[PDB]
Amino acid sequence: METGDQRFGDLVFRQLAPNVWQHTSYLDMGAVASNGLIVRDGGRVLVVDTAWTDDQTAQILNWIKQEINLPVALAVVTHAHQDKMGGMDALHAAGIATYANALSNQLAPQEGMVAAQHSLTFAANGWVEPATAPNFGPLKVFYPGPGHTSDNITVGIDGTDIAFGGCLIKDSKAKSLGNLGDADTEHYAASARAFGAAFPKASMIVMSHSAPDSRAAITHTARMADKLR
Numbered sequence: 001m002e003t004g005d006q007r008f009g010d011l012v013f014r015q016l017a018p019n020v021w022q023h024t025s026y027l028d029m030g031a032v033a034s035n036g037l038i039v040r041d042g043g044r045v046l047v048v049d050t051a052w053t054d055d056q057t058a059q060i061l062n063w064i065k066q067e068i069n070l071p072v073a074l075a076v077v078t079h080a081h082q083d084k085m086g087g088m089d090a091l092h093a094a095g096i097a098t099y100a101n102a103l104s105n106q107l108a109p110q111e112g113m114v115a116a117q118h119s120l121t122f123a124a125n126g127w128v129e130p131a132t133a134p135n136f137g138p139l140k141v142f143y144p145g146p147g148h149t150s151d152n153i154t155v156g157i158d159g160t161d162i163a164f165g166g167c168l169i170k171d172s173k174a175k176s177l178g179n180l181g182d183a184d185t186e187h188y189a190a191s192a193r194a195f196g197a198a199f200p201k202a203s204m205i206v207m208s209h210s211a212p213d214s215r216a217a218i219t220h221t222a223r224m225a226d227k228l229r
């Protein structure tokens, strides 16, 4: 927890830009961090990823109400793991519209997760079909291909130098990819590089389990992935 960070309950918030904050929640497994984003877009707020749990995700919503005081219009979640979708019910209880890759929603029940209300689909070039992501404002959603998981998606924030790699991208000092059973080790490297190419001017790379990094996180991640093919 660095200087300039705010704490609300068990959550930590770091402002990254005038209209963007990183939310961080922890699960004791020894407190393992997971990062998401909060975006102020005019008179509304957009959320990328829940916290680990419903209660933690409610803390995010209370912090937003208290510190930003704008309604949360929608949330997009970036794949079907507990750190990204664990608080879906808290969002739904607040009347927030939720979006995920169709595959994430298909996987959610098997994972003991609650599926989002709406499914995103993607063109062959990886960009989201705009009709499935209505009124996403500055959020530009890109499916880079299979990597960390088959369903992982990524998000750039228009008007900023920020892109969110989710759990696909590791920080540039990482000693391993942590890749498990559901990783695609054949395509991981190409998918990391695809994320980089989709958001070629993003200079701040936000990710799920490390603090924000430079684009070196992308190239370092791709190098680690090259070794697995």
Ligand SMILES: O=C(O)[C@@H]1CS[C@H]2CS[C@H](CS)N21
Pocket: 032, 081, 082, 083, 167, 178, 209
């Ligand atoms: O693989 C990881 O590094 C992170 C932290 S521990 C492991 C279990 S939950 C979450 C899924 S991305 N995760």
Ligand SMILES: [Zn+2]
Pocket: 079, 081, 148, 149, 167
């Ligand atoms: Zn994951």
Ligand SMILES: [Zn+2]
Pocket: 034, 081, 083, 167, 208, 209
């Ligand atoms: Zn994760």
